[PDB]
Amino acid sequence: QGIEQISKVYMHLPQTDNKKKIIITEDGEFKALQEWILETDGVSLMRVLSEKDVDPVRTTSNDIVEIFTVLGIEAVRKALERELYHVISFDGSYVN
C-alpha cells in the first residue's frame, strides 16, 4: 500500500496559527481551528492530491518543479514566492 517516493509521513497538530485551519465564523470573526496535518519525505503531488479524503486545495509541496509540472507557471510563481519568503523570514528578518 501507499504511493512510491514517500518514505515517511509525520502526523501532527500545528500549534502555530499560520498552518492552523483559519475560518470566518458566522459572526464574522477569525477562528483558528486545530486540525491534523501530515508532512512527508519525498514528493508525488499528483498522486497524493488524487487520494480520497485529502484536501485538494490547501495541499502543497516544497518542491517547486513538482508544482510547475502539476499545477503551472502562476502556481509555481506563487509557491516559489512563499518558499523564499519562508526561508528568509524564518530567522526573524524582514524584507519588502
Binding site: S50, P56, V57, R58, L71
Partner: protein
C-alpha cells in the same frame, strides 16, 4: 476494485464538467453538482456497466451553439490508432471539430503523432486519467485565468503600446493552458490577489 473505480469515474466526470464550464461550454448546474450516489443512480461497474463509451458526453458553447465538444473515454490501457480513427469518424458524422480524449494510464507514441498531424482540421487533446482526478483550478496557488478575445488583446496592446512578444509567456503544455485548451497565440489574463495593491492583473502569451 469496483468501489474505488466508480468513485474515480464520478470524480473525473465532475472534473471534466467543471472544465467544460470553464471553457464556456453549456453544462447544467445539476451535473456540476452531481453527487456520487447520483452517479450511482444515473448509471456497480465491474463489467456491470463500465461502458466507457457510455460515459462519453457532448456539450455545446454558450454563445456559439454550432461550436460543440465531445469528451471520450477509451476503455483500452494505451490508446491505439484505430480507436482514434473511430473517434474522428464519429466527429465527421456529427461535424464536431474539438474533442479531448482521456486515457487510462498512457497513450501510444504512434497516437501522439496521429493526433498532432491531423490537428489543423480537427482539434484533439490527450489527458491522463491521473490529471483529471482533481480540478487544479480550485487549488489555492493557481490564480484566476481567463482567456481574452482578440478584440481584448488588440485593446491591451494598443493601451500599453506593446507587441505580443513583449508580454511574459506561458507554455502551451502548461497544466492550466491544457485545461483551458488554449492554442499558441492566445493571451490569458491572470487575476491574482496581491499583498501590496489588493488585486493584480497580468497577461501571459501562449508560446
Amino acid at each position: 476494485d469496483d468501489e474505488e473505480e466508480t468513485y474515480r469515474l464520478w470524480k473525473i466526470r465532475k472534473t471534466i464538467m467543471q472544465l467544460c464550464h470553464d471553457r464556456g461550454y453549456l453544462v447544467t448546474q445539476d451535473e456540476l453538482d452531481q453527487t456520487l450516489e447520483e452517479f450511482k443512480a444515473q448509471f456497480k461497474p465491474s463489467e456491470g456497466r463500465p461502458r466507457r463509451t457510455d460515459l462519453t458526453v457532448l456539450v455545446a458553447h454558450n454563445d456559439d451553439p454550432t461550436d460543440q465538444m465531445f469528451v471520450f473515454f477509451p476503455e483500452e490501457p494505451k490508446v491505439g490508432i484505430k480507436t482514434i480513427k473511430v473517434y474522428c469518424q464519429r466527429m465527421q458524422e456529427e461535424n464536431i471539430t474539438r474533442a479531448l480524449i482521456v486515457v487510462q494510464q498512457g497513450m501510444t507514441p504512434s497516437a501522439k503523432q496521429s493526433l498532432v498531424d491531423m490537428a489543423p482540421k480537427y482539434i484533439l487533446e490527450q489527458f491522463l486519467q491521473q490529471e483529471l482526478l482533481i480540478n487544479i483550478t480550485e487549488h489555492e496557488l493557481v490564480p484566476e485565468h481567463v482567456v481574452m478575445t482578440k478584440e481584448e488583446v488588440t485593446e491591451l496592446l494598443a493601451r500599453y503600446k506593446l507587441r505580443e512578444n513583449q508580454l511574459p509567456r506561458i507554455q502551451a503544455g502548461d497544466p492550466v493552458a491544457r485545461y483551458f485548451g488554449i492554442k499558441r497565440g492566445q493571451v490569458v489574463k491572470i487575476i491574482r490577489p496581491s499583498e501590496t495593491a489588493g488585486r493584480y492583473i497580468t497577461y501571459r502569451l501562449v508560446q
